[PDB]
């Protein structure tokens, strides 16, 4: 969708800074969260880190 793409564009380099190799996969996963959780991700470095690591071990297990 047009809106989730804009979200994804803002989120992507931030995820890439922490997971250069899986940024595309992780961003797409992240974009399935509730609006509320997405907002929090945008607003909060620490909150995003938590989701990114969450996403990481869902992938590797």
């Amino acid at each position: 969708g047009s809106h989730r793409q804009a979200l994804g564009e803002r989120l992507y380099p931030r995820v890439q800074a922490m997971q250069p190799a899986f940024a595309s996969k992780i961003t797409g996963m992240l974009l399935e969260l509730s609006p509320a959780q997405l907002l929090l991700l945008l607003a909060s470095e620490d909150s995003l880190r938590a989701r990114v690591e969450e996403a990481m071990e869902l992938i590797v297990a």
Partner: peptide, 12 residues
């Protein structure tokens, strides 16, 4: 709930 089946995202 995070989802290994989500589509991959593609920047521009």
């Amino acid at each position: 709930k995070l989802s290994v089946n989500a589509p991959e995202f593609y920047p521009s």
